[model samples]
Target: KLPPGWEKRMFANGTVYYFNHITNASQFERPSG
Candidate 1:
C-alpha cells in the first residue's frame, strides 16, 4: 500500500516513539530502510 511520495526513510530514530504517537500505526515496522 505504498502511496505516492510515501517512501520509507532511514534515520537514527526508531519506531518506539513513532508507534507510540501514531496509535493506529504498527511497531513491527522495521527501522531499517
Candidate 2:
C-alpha cells in the first residue's frame, strides 16, 4: 500500500524525483493509467 500522506506526482506532468533503483528497475515499470 502507498504510504500515508505521501506526495505522489506524475511524470507525465513532471518528475517526482530522480532516483536510481537499479536492483529494482527490472522488477517494475513506470506506473500506468
Candidate 3:
C-alpha cells in the first residue's frame, strides 16, 4: 500500500517505490537496475 495518488519513483540504488491506491499505504519494489 502507499500514499494517495502516488506514482512510481526510483532511488539511487535503482529501487522502486509507489503508492497503492487499493491499500492506501507505502509500497516498495525491487531494483530494476
Q: List the residue pairs that clash in candidate 1.
A: none
Per-candidate TM-scores read 0.25, 0.19, 0.37
Backbone Cα, N, C clashes tallied per candidate: 0, 0, 4
lDDT per residue for candidate 1 within 1-33, as digits (tens), equals 343223344347752322323234433454333
lDDT for model 2 comes to 0.34
Q: Assess each prediction's global lDDT (C-alpha) against the native.
A: 0.37, 0.34, 0.58
lDDT, candidate 3, 1-33, per-residue tens:
333566676679987776545556565763231
Could you tell me the lDDT of residue 31 within candidate 2? 36
TM-score, ranked from best to worst: 3, 1, 2
Q: Give the 10-residue window scoring lowest on summed lDDT in candidate 2.
A: 19-28
Cα lDDT, model 3, residue 6 = 62
Candidate with more favorable, higher TM-score: 2 or 3: 3
| Model 3 Cα shift for residue 13 (angstroms) | 0.7
- Candidate ordering by lDDT (highest first): 3, 1, 2
